[PDB]
Design a protein around this ligand. Structure first.
Ligand SMILES: COC(=O)[C@H]1O[C@H](O[C@@H]2[C@H](O)[C@@H](O)[C@@H](O[C@@H]3[C@H](O)[C@@H](O)[C@@H](O[C@@H]4[C@H](O)[C@@H](O)[C@@H](O[C@@H]5[C@H](O)[C@@H](O)[C@@H](O[C@@H]6[C@H](O)[C@@H](O)[C@@H](O)O[C@@H]6C(=O)OC)O[C@@H]5C(=O)O)O[C@@H]4C(=O)O)O[C@@H]3C(=O)O)O[C@@H]2C(=O)OC)[C@H](O)[C@@H](O)[C@H]1O
Length: 342
């Protein structure tokens, strides 16, 4: 038995429906009782920020129910300032017990068109991160089932508490799943995209850029999933599994790369095509303003029973034992939270 508190549709022939998702969300009474919104097929050009606990979105179909907006970090606001990476997100989750089911969320920033622009073109953006979905420090217990997340650089920003992604598609290029959250992915397709702007022999992207605090047990955990190339034009050995993001952070002694953001990405029972070469390093700025490199061997980067052509086993690709693998069950990663849909 499932009932909807509000319905969103493109048609006036439907009847008692909201025209925009933002209006339906805003109509929810203040509080924390479950509020469930059905979103009928259509492309909704909207940016959403969710601040109400226990809010749930259900699309008519993943293929047909789309929430989309185009915003890069370097896109300018009215006051002439940049949106920034966090500010670029199509959907921002800043509440507890959110779920989305059977819908697509896109950042439509046209990265390839941007890169094709002439270097002297003043409209050419340098800050090319364009987030589709952002779970903030305030977000905990966010559940995404049968969802597709679309972007290029920085598609999915997972911060804060626990998020669970199931039966999902996530596409991107550079650092397309990133942040310090506990994010568990199960039965997802992680799609590495073609880079027209990258020379043969150079890196096209990185699936993950975790910034997990060293004291946090779990970061990005990918299980029973598929790491796939968007097309046959995506070269062999063009994508890294992850690189360590140490975010620029304000400390008492200045603003610099966080030394304690020692990210975790663990792949378990996941297929990988041969676009995967292994792990990689990442640079930041230190407390003195010098370039500092953070290395994968110093980070929490592990695999367990990877398969497919990209699943090579070497000293540069650390493997979990059976006993270690048992620490990455849904129960252990998510703790007392069982993700449920209304
Ligand atoms: C806690 O106190 C309050 O309550 C506070 O709330 C308000 O403020 C908000 C927010 O709550 C607060 O945390 C904050 O702060 C800073 C920024 O303003 C904010 O945008 C955000 O920054 C992130 C990120 O944390 C930061 O490290 C930086 O990251 C860049 C880059 O954007 C990012 O994509 C990545 O890039 C890598 C790589 O470095 C790069 O070379 C290339 O290769 O791309 C890579 C990539 O794609 O990876 C994904 O890392 C970069 C880096 O490490 O430098 O910028 C990010 C961003 O722009 O979003 O958090 C910042 C911080 O705290 O350090 O302020 C916010 C705000 O003011 O709103 C706009 C209230 O305003 C305030 O009054 C108070 O109440």
């Amino acid at each position: 038995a499932t009932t909807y508190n509000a319905v969103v549709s493109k048609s006036s022939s439907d009847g008692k429906t909201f025209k925009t998702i933002a209006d339906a969300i805003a109509s929810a009474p203040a509080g924390s009782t479950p509020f469930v919104i059905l979103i009928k097929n259509g492309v909704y050009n909207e940016r959403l920020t969710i601040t109400r606990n226990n809010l749930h979105l259900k699309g008519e179909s993943r293929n047909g129910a789309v929430i989309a907006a185009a915003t890069a970090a370097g896109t300018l606001k009215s006051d002439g300032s940049k949106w920034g990476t966090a500010g670029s997100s199509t959907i921002t989750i800043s509440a507890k017990d959110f779920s989305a089911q059977s819908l697509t969320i896109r950042n439509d920033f046209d990265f390839p068109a941007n890169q094709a622009k002439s270097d002297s073109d003043s409209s050419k953006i340098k800050d090319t991160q364009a987030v589709a979905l952002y779970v903030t420090k305030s977000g905990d217990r966010a559940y995404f089932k049968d969802v597709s997340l679309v972007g290029y650089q920085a598609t999915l920003y997972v911060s804060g508490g626990r998020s669970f992604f199931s039966d999902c598609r996530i596409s991107g290029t550079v650092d397309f799943i990133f942040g310090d959250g506990t994010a568990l992915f199960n039965n997802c397709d992680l799609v590495s995209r073609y880079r027209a702007d990258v020379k043969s022999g150079n890196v096209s992207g990185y699936l993950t850029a975790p910034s997990t605090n060293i004291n946090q047990k779990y970061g990005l955990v990918i299980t029973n999933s598929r790491v796939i190339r968007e097309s046959d034009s995506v070269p062999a050995k063009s994508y890294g599994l992850g690189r360590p993001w140490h975010p620029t952070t304000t400390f008492s002694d200045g603003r610099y790369a966080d030394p304690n953001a020692i990210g975790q990405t663990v792949f378990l029972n996941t297929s990988m095509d041969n676009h995967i070469y292994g792990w990689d390093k990442m640079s930041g700025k230190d407390k003195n303003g010098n370039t500092i490199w953070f290395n994968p061997e110093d980070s929490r980067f592990f695999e367990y029973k990877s398969y497919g052509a990209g699943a090579t086993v070497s000293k540069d690709r650390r493997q979990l034992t059976d006993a270690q693998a048992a620490e990455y069950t849904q129960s252990k990663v998510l703790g007392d939270w069982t993700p449920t849909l209304p």
